[PDB]
Amino acid sequence: DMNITVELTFFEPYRLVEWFDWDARKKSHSAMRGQAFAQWTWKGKGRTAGKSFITGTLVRSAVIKAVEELLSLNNGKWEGVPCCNGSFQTDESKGKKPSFLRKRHTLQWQANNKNICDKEEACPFCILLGRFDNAGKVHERNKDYDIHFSNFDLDHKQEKNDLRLVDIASGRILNRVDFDTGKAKDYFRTWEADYETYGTYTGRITLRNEHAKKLLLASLGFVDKLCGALCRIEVIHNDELRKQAEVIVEAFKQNDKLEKIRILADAIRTLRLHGEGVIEKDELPDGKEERDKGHHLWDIKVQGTALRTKLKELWQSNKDIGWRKFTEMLGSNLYLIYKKETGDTEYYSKAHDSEGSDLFIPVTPPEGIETKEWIIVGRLKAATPFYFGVQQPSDSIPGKEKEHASFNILLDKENRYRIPRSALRGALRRDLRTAFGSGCNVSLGGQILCNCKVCIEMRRITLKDSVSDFSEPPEIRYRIAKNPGTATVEDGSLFDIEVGPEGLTFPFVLRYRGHKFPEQLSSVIRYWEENDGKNGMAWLGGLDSTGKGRFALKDIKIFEWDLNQKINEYIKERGMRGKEKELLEMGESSLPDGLIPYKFFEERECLFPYKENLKPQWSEVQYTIEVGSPLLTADTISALTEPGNRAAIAYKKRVYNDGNNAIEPEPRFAVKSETHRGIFRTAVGRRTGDLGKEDHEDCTCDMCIIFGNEHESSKIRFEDLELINGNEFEKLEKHIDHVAIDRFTGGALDKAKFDTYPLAGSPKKPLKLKGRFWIKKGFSGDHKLLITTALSDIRDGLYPLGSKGGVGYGWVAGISIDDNVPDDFKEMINGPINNDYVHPGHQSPKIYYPHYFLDSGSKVYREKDIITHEEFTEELLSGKINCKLETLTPLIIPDTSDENGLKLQGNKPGHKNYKFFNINGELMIPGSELRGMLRTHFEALTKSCFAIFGEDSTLSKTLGGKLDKALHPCTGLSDGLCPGCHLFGTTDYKGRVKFGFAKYENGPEWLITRGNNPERSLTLGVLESPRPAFSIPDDESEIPGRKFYLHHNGWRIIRQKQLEIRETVQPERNVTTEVMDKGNVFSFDVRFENLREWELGLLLQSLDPGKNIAHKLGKGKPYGFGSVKIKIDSLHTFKINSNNDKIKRVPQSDIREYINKGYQKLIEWVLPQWHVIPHIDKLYKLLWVPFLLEPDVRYPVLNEESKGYIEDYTYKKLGDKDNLPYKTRVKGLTTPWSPWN
RNA sequence: GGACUUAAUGUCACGGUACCCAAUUUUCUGCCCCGG
RNA sequence: AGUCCGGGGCAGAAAAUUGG
Ligand SMILES: [Zn+2]
Ligand SMILES: [Zn+2]
Ligand SMILES: [Zn+2]
Ligand SMILES: [Zn+2]
Secondary structure: OOEEEEEEEEOOOOOEEEOOOHHHHOOOHHHHHOOOOEEEOOOOOOOOOOOEEEOHHHHHHHHHHHHHHHHHHOOOOEOOEOOOOOOOOOOOOOOOOOOOOOOOOEEOOOOOOOOOOOOOOOOHHHHHHOOOOOOOOOOOOOOOOOEEEEEEEEOOOOOOOOOOHHHHEOOEEEEEEOOOOOOEEEEEEEOOEOOOOOOEEEEEEEEOOOOOHHHHHHHHHHOOOEOOEOEEEEEOOOOHHHHHHHHHHHHHHHOOOOOOOOHHHHHHHHOOOOOOHHHHOOOOOOOOOOOOOOOOOOOOEOOOOEHHHHHHHHHHHOOOOOOHHHHHHHHHHHHHHHHOOOOOOEOOOOOOOOOOOOOOOEEOOOOOOOOEEEEEEEEEEEOOOOEOOOOOOOOOOOOOOOOOOOEOOOEOOOOOEEEOHHHHHHHHHHHHHHHHOOOOOOOOOOOOOOOOOOHHHHOOEEOOOEEOOOOOOOOOEEEEEEEOOOOEEEEEEEEEEOOOOEOOOOEEEEEEOOOOOOHHHHHHHHHHEOOOOOOOOEEOOEOOOOOOOEEEEEEEEEEEEEOOOOHHHHHHHHHHOOOHHHHHHOOHHHOOOOOOOOOOOOOHHHOHHHHHHHOOOOEEEEEEEEEOOOOOOOOHHHHOOOOOOOOOOOOEOOEEOOOOOOEOOOOOEEEOHHHHHHHHHHHHHHHHOOOOOOOOOOOOOOOHHHHOOOOOOOOEEEOOEEEOOOOOOOOOEOOEOOOOEOOOOOOEOOOOOOOEOOEOOEOOEOEEEEEEEEEOOOOOHHHHHHHHHHHHHHHOOOOOOOOOHHHOOOOEEEEEEOOOOOHHHHOOOOOOOOOOOOOOOOOOOOOOOOOEEEOOOOOOOOOOOOOOOOOOOOOOEEEOEEEEEEEOOOOOOEOOOOOEOOOOOOOOOOOEEOOEOEEOOEEOOOHHHHHHHHHHHHHHHHOOOOOOOOOOOOOOOOHHHHOOOOOOOOOOOOOOOOHHHHHHOOOOOOOOOEEOOOOOOOOOOOOOOOOOOOOOOEOOOOOOOOOOOOOOOOOOOOOOOEEEOOOOOOHHHHHHOOHHHHOOOOOOOOEEEOOOOOOOOOOEEEEEEEEOHHHHHHHHHHHOOOOOEOEEOOOOOOOOOOEEEEEEEEEEEOOOOHHHOOOEEOOOOOOOOOHHHHHHHHOOOOOOOHHHOHHHHHHHHHOEOOOOOOOOOOOOOOOOOOOOOOOOOOOOOOOOOOOOOHHHHHHHHHOOOOOOO
């Protein structure tokens, strides 16, 4: 008669499955999969929006479980009303079994038989079961049930609008992972809903009988499991943005930037990290300061207006959907615009086909025992960034079946990071399995309960979903798949990961309902705890091998309730299900009645199972690296934002303050753990020689076990490499510019200036890089010594951290070990040569021209069979070459980052004030300078090709067509490759030789130039861009060759006529800087790996040409500035085999049996005689230094200079076709020291 | 409240981490000669 | 035939943004 209506208060994302029909359930095994979940209904025939509900039989079963447990904990004394065990058996005559069996450990008593119960004085348990009711199972046909559990429809939130399924349910994927491997054994769909809006259900229950109210109310207040989540029970633009993306893609298409229709989309999606003002306040980075072209991508005129203003207008017209939801949507639209033109297994196992035993299994607790419960709550901090997976992007489509980018992180409808309950439960399962030492892998579909070692405690433990107290867009980490064959990027190798920020805190609960608190839980809770040394090791989440998902549970507080005497207080309070947020900050003085904290908790070093199989599983050892060279991490995509106009910037992490909200304003510069892993993997592969094989799917070599494979999870996992020595520089970030000098004109290419922007760092003050790497307790002695050798290879600087190693960036120079108990791995870790070759150089030993051309004909040889960049080869040499860079003439190397370094701009506005290159206040030399000069020298010596050529040019058109089809630059790696690029390295192939940064640390610091008018500096004559029109004027003449300058003491003229060139003419249109003195001792290194024997000698004596020959460096090369010669200190060589652990150097007997092989090989294309070769003689003639006589070399003037031209030999008489025809002009620029007079 | 949507003497889906391999990267001197 | 002429033109193109 009297009716009860109750509400369902959900405090965790529940589940719901399409109901279909009972007869149609067996058709869809997902139906029996979701019989314990909620249900969904469809109104129309077009699968339109409907309504959701939970079956009344489900809440009936929940009530039955609640009464069974409550009566079992009460020992059958429910306020003096005994209850019988009850009947759970069917098939009395012909079956008629209920739609759901039990297959559960039913709890009963010893006897529990006060009297025989019939349908006259039935027990309250009988009434709740309704065994003696007046209704059957076939159909209702009336309200004849003693107790009725009707539908539980929605709350008031379900207005008559017929809410869409998308607004209430979201598609999701649930996984399962085996122990020994790490691959997803099986995945299946799920429809995890939300508890924010549609988190309440209302249902009506009827109880015709009277002697059942107290137990029913106690059960209703005791149930804590409903649809798969906690519950509290009480009694009561896609079209306009699509068109815009199409328009902008078409505009970029006619803008010839067909390939560039993706890099702007990447940066636009990156804009969600930044605020509205990143595109609204003023603009994206402006770009070139004075080129009158703007930024190479953002200041581009699209549909008339600039791209930095067209998108601003778009934002102004689309402010409705906010910043994040507009930026992400526009990025997805751009991805779709580009992509419009450019198997796994499931396992549900919910069926009765296995068997039909369904045997009753009584389980009676022992008499006199005390059963308690424990709630473990705290904060789950993440000391490392965390990534959580999700189904394919934009493929969720809830309610239907059969952005688009990256591996999206899991976010709720609130659009913030969240740890799914299932992931935390699985991590706990794995950790408890490790603590036990043995168990059974989870196999679904089992009709009988799995009596595993760890499965027993799973029935008695529960935990809830966790959501961030933080809502910001996540950064997008970049990963590449570099081929070990060529150490570069191949097709289909880049992808994106949307990791979160480190330091974020999460709520975390662990409620255990068992007889006694197990020691394994008490050990794993300290294993996760962040103690003084443990620091937490909860590897919860995804990409655990890479280094993401190492949570450290913190601030653990213990509470326990009573189920034997204080059950009714638990019934009243319901265990604070959903109130754990207040429980986090609820102090010791505000505890409710009972619920004393569990005071039997022990310390970390007190439990046996912790020290047996919990902590030994991981042995973290932290090592600090110092680097004496600038470091660059290639964050180019993020460089298309923030002021600076720089095409290459370092990668910066993002951390969250502990105890303080929001991100610190200063980002943490760091090296990605992904590169930390890649360098180690490449090193171990090259030492083992197993890189470059077919695959590692079924392989079991030295690589698959240590670093994982397609099947098994990696047994080594790393962490982010962060820089700790940050606040000790005040100039931590240093700008360095790079150019690609044309080999035909001696100047910059048409469009090749690739400016960079790396960190700072000096050999006397290095960047302290700190990190850690984890080892599991299964590596044998050989593998441990192998990993120590892996560290030792970094100790010798073989592998450069960061990018652009071939210049000298990020050269490690030693690793130190901390005192975090690393003792497991701590224990395991003559005269310089000088060539005597002398060149005569008797072209004019007793008027010249500064730059000469080197014609070498059309004879070109290229090596089709490229030498792979795989594991080190024993016979091919590899090592370092220490050298002394000796300065003869003043050396002029400007730090072009600061155009006002000399602070002379105030006296002369608009005058460039360059400063000498220096890193962290110490004298340095750009590695790229030596790289380029030595590459030019080697290529000209080998006369192979033109490394950099200025194609598509007009000279007095088609300058690239005049050059014959044999000297073209290094094309793809199929038709051939330049021998000069075979060693130095062309595109899509890493060069084996990595140049270094020189550290002088000796000699006079400055060229004082006593008596000079300029103060603590000097001036220099303004230089003009080359005009190759006069170089190759005649159409009949084909092309000149390489451009080489001459060596002379021409700096004396500049140092003498300084006032006549800096004050008389060009008051502002001039460049000035500081130069070096003579006799400056230097030291720089030239590393290499896997070099052929015959190329090593060429490299060595092209480094040191010999006596009376020096290399040209710095500006003012036509003016004679910067004549320097480098002499080898000692050529080293290391042995791959561990037998020869110590490194060796070649004998100092003039480096015997090395250069002669290359000298002999050159004739195909005892002391060496390089003047017996037509082109080497000319090459060495141009580099001859006739000052260690004094020839004078200078540019002539057209008609009359401002101060000079003492007199003939001007640009008219020489330029006239009669007095000096152009036919002999090329001859005069090719023959060294021609007699122009 | 009937009506979309359940049977009732019996659901461990707290019976399952979208978990796994793939180094944002190699290559490039901040260089300098005459032409409407 | 009739005097001035320049001292800044490059300031990144080119290679991958999907495969088991
Ligand atoms: Zn009874
Ligand atoms: Zn088990
Ligand atoms: Zn293998
Ligand atoms: Zn080449």
